[PDB]
């Protein structure tokens, strides 16, 4: 019913936001299968900055309280062929993220599964009739391997491995 994100420290309820987009990295190399793998961005604050779709919330991996697209999900990249270029996703409908104040945040599983379906449909326009698989972050530093965000003078780190574990046709 919901997807849970373990956070540290514990974000209070007034930190609840609307997910308005995210930023991805396409996995490189030969595929030996008709699939394309996407993970949270392996970049840094510059990939997020060139997205130009954030609002007033400093965050990695997911964009909170930002601006939404006007018609449908829009994906933008410098070079789609370049795996070292991050894929910026701007949603048309926001997805509520609610944190309980006890140390975890929750996202509707039906709403997120609807959102990834729209994203996977948009990536297939750029990469063809291939299976779209999202996987967790490949690794990195805490504030970038986790969905981290600022709220009320404090910086929180939320693991997102439950948001990126699905296969779509």
């Amino acid at each position, epitope marked *: 019913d919901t997807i849970t994100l373990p956070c540290r420290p514990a974000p209070p309820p007034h930190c609840s936001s609307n997910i308005t987009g995210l930023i991805l*990295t*396409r*996995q*490189g*190399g*030969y*595929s*030996n299968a008709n699939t394309v*793998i996407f*993970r949270p*961005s*392996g*970049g*840094d*604050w*510059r990939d997020i900055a060139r997205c130009q779709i954030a609002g007033t919330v400093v965050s990695t991996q997911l964009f909170l309280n930002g601006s939404l697209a006007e018609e449908e999900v829009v994906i933008r990249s410098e*070079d789609w*062929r*370049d*795996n*070292a*270029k991050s894929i910026c996703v701007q949603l048309a409908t926001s997805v509520e993220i609610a944190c309980t104040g006890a140390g975890h945040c929750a996202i509707s599983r039906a709403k997120w599964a609807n959102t990834l379906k729209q994203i996977a449909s948009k990536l297939r326009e750029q990469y063809g009739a291939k299976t779209i698989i999202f996987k967790p*972050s*490949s*690794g*990195g*530093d805490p504030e*970038f*391997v986790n969905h981290s965000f600022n709220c009320g003078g404090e910086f929180f780190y939320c693991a997102s491995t439950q948001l990126f574990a699905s296969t779509w046709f």
Partner: antibody
Amino acid sequence: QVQLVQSGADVKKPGASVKVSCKASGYTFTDYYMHWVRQAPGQGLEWMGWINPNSGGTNYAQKFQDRVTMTRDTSVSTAYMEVSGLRSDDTAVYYCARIKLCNGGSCNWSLGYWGQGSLVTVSS
Amino acid sequence: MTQSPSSLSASVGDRVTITCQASQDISNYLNWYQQKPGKAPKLLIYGASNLETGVPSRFSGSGSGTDFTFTISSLQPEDIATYYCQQYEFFGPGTKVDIKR
């Protein structure tokens, strides 16, 4: 002035792991991703992945996913590439490389600078 | 990707032509490398037609889209090396150029 100095040759048992280092000098380490490319004896070139030295993020070739770990140490501007579960076909020279800006932006994968390479033999 | 031929021999002063084909329209985002025995590959051409700084004028490259060419206008004995084309993470199999005398 830019150079990449890698670790020496190494021999490892089949099924074990090997960790290769590559120390950078002559430039600001965090301004360029580090690529790793291998070459089996007498064969072509094969990219394994890159690491962002600002954030630690990586992107491996699917062929090496869940088998290779790339990390860095900025204080000594060194990148590391650890390959585990080695098989006989991992015998190769392992290179670190970075790009040189294209002047116009078409060189995000133009490896203008390479290390000397680390020969890793997998045998018993 | 694909490279043609796989190996060729040429005399000093000869014109050498190497062809590399991509599967997708990469515009001009193609690089060419020279690998002499015993050392790291060396970038000669970037952006399909641009020469790396310091490279003699006998090296050049052309092409756009899927079909690209690498050209040594006058072969010198120190140009014996295996030549690779490269687009993004993908390297071609290489063309080995040696000299007949």
